Amino acid sequence: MDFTTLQNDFTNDYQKALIANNEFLEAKKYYNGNQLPQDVLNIILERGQTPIIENMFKVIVNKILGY
């Protein structure tokens, strides 16, 4: 009802829901093409290779959402 318990309960709720929000943001990044990690991208780009990303589960989600 004042700022103290609001800040403390927001901290307790945000810290215990960070491990799921991080996975949510990972899932939204994987849905939008960002599927390779940084070190894998560096390993691919050091060989002069173009990184090809097959977004094979975007069409799955698009099929279920199209239903």
Partner 1 sequence: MIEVSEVIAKVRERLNDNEVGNYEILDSVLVENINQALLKICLEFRLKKAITRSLITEEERFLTLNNLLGIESVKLDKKEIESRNTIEKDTGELELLILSDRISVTPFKIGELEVVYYTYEEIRNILETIKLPKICLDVLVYSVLCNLLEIPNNETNFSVLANYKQLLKLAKDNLTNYLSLMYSKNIHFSKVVRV
CB 53 within 8 A of CB 33: yes
Minimum CB separation of residue 51 from partner 1 in Å reads 11
Site for partner 1 in 7-66 (CB under 8 A): 47-50
Minimum CB separation of residue 33 from partner 1 in Å reads 22
Measure the CA–CA gap between 34 and 15, rounded to whole angstroms.
Answer: 25
> Minimal CA–CA distance to 27: which of 36, 37, 35, 19?
35
Minimum CB separation of residue 52 from partner 1 in Å reads 12
Applying CB under 8 A, the residues found at the interface with partner 1 are 47-50
